[PDB]
Amino acid sequence: EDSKEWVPVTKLGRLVREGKIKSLEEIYLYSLPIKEFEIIDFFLGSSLKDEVLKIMPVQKQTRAGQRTRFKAFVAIGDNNGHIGLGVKCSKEVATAIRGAIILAKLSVVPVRRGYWGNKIGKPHTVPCKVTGKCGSVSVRLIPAPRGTGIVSAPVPKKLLTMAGIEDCYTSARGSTGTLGNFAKATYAAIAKTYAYLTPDLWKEMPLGSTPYQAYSDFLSKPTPRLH
Amino acid sequence: AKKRKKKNYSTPKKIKHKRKKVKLAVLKYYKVDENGKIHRLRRECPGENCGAGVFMAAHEDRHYCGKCNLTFVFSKPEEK
RNA sequence: CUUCCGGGAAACCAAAGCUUUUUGGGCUCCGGGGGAAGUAUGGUUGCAAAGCUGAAACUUAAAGGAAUUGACGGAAGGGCACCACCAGGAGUGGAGCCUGCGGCUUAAUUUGACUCAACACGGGAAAACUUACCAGGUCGAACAUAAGUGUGUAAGACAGAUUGAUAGCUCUUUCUCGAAUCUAUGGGUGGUGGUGCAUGGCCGUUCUUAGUUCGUGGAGUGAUUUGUCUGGUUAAUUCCGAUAACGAAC
RNA sequence: ACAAAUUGCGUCUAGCAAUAAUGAGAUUGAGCAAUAACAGGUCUGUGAUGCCCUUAGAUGUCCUGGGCUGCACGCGCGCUACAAUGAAAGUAUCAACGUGUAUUUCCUAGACCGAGAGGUCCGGGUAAACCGCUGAACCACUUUCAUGCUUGGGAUUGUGAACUGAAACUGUUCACGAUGAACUUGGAAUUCCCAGUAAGUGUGAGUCAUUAACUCGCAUUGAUUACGUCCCUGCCCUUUGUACACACC
Q1: Which of A29, A108, B11, B13 would disulfide-bridge A84, Cβ 3.0–4.6 Å?
Q2: Which residues in this protein are found as Phosphoserine (chain A)?
């Protein structure tokens, strides 16, 4: 049971419901705005587990007298090469986590996993070393050989067991109790791994189809073709 | 044993008896004359409103029947 | 000034940047939770005031930085209303009396309520009843057990005591409908008994108001803001109109 | 007023103007009320209730009493005053909201008697139909008074006569003829309110065996003054400040 087939709202998710794109990294190929989580329910959803990290309450001082709203964290990662992070405040803990798992799905980004020192057999850790700072915590991911698992604090070890990164070295400076700045620091470190010009990426591409060009007919038609 | 605040233990000793039973045996006291006349100890009620099954009292010069202990006072009161 | 399209915890900074991912242009001075304490003591300089050097015993879990949201709470600028004045009018506060609350006392003077938002309130205008308080009284209420057996286990009145009234409530002496076997024992039962600072409910005021919120965006690491505003006008978050989602919602 | 109502147009839009109507210059007050809250109040409104306490010897319960009313005193709501605009006598002669008895003593018409208080006798009425055309009060109209704690003012205490009810005693209330005190406009402080309103003036209902002296509604008589402003106590998320937690107590 769906029970509701998603409506194509943007022109991008028009095409995945009409199946004109059948590869998730095509929107990563041109860095599209992935602004419906109903996109990634098509491509993935098989093998996409949610874990929360904290349901940190937060308060405001009204004149009589306080008011609590809940900044629940959630973390989704396809178990090899895609990771996301979700944060939202609302009046109930249910209406955070029923909607936090949305906000992690929208920001799901691809991981580059690279060989540590000897290119044999499905690369695992990280191609380079990456720091992601989000406000005074900065986790410094480092490769490691095969068979030494994720050494970190227990929180971003959960950010990397679900990222597909297999054997990583980490070191985190700063106020590492602030969980928002310790999830996002690693999230801004994992996602970096495809934004660093390793010398393996010099020969370029044919440089484009830009699928609003490749499928300009189906967006020219106003008829909502089914399936 | 209740609880209060100001006034406790007036205690009129709460002596209320149930029934002393120091007298008034059930009428095993009776006698029949042999063949065949009977003597009715506590001879019965002459009041015609009952079936004369009361064993009317032996007392001082005021007696009474058994269906009503206060009334049927043996004085006798004459009506004329 | 404008911005990072650099950094930062931020406020910010054209350096407070190139402090990159365990980073490197030289060089020197300085900091290591807060106090104790720039104290104590020694040296040294000064006419002196004092300056430079400078601890510890002890004490302690926070102390501190920057920023958000709480005061259209003694700060500006707005905008209302007679539980605000002002221009008054009538008033009470004075007098006697009815009450209300206290304090007093008493056997008890049952009590809840104490600024607006307790006080001719609790609809609380009570001889009894109410009545919760005070004195005298009075009533009894469950069962399996159980022990008289039905040789009266009971229950009722006279009569003289006890009474406030006949309360055979109790009783001197009397007859009696006798059985729910009237049980010490389960323990439920009532309660105007306690806690409104354990609660439900309603109601009160906060607030005569005009004020709140949500998804979707851009704002921030974040608390949180934006929408929900500059102005004009309105009784008004009522509307034009800047129109930073709105079609919104109360 | 069912508002293009015209009006040297305000940011082309919400330029007051009183001007137009001639039942109508709102006929016009109420109810209604969000989010977040308070250790507000209510366990004594409830068979709403946690828990606590108690139960033949009750805090439960019915009876007879008592009290809740008692007093050197303090405090608030409120009553009639402190008088010639008045206190008396007379006459004239306007309401409205309402309410009223068949498992409870209501509304009372009529005659009659009684200083009165009331009482008797006989009706009406379950109510647009009877009480009831409720023919309300203050005020209007001639007089007595001649400001003199007076005839203003009726607390105060005797006495009997009464009513309602088992029962009236800092009293259940009510009648008469006595008793005439304080009180002469009330200090500092201080409340209320803008049109039929304020205040004066009654009446009904609510409780109620009888008891308003209070609370809700009703009508009558009917003003002064503002038509404003933010000094005042005020209150509303605009800006800014902070070392403020339970937030300037």
Answers
A1: A108
A2: 23
